[PDB]
Description:
The structure is cut from a larger assembly and holds chains A and B.
Chain A (H helix, E strand, L loop, with lengths): L12 E7 L27
Chain B lengths: L3 H8 L4 E7 L16 E2 L9 E3 L4 E5 L3 E10 L9 E8 L3 E11 L3
Antiparallel strand pairs in B: 1-2, 1-5, 3-7, 4-7, 5-6
Amino acid sequence: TRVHSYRGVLIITDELTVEAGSRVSLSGYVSDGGTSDVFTICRLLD
Amino acid sequence: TLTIDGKNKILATLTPTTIVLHNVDPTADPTANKVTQPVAIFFSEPNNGLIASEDTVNITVPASATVSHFSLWDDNSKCVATGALSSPQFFAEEGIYVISSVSIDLNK
């Protein structure tokens, strides 16, 4: 009788996954003119 | 939100190439706790906003080491993704870690 044993290595298996997300943000409004240069009263003529 | 077509295009540029294990959560200072060597990892083409590893990779963990977290370093030495494993494991002797599959996903 021997009963003699052996020894191995520590083998482990795992599944890893990292995830993320996305969101789009928008801000708009109906045009009521716009930032202009030389905002002055005018007198058009044809 | 992004489109399925949009996600596929964007994912085709991350291209992780190597994976490094860690002992502490590598959030910030990812260059520290570099327990293992940069073993190469191959990823497939984007599909439905998801890339998966092409094959199983084996990590040559050194003896008397503990690994709990990993990181996917790309070609130009950038840490693009951190992450934890199932449970912190102590590699008391020499051993190898088997990564069955790692998948990057944006469908969330």
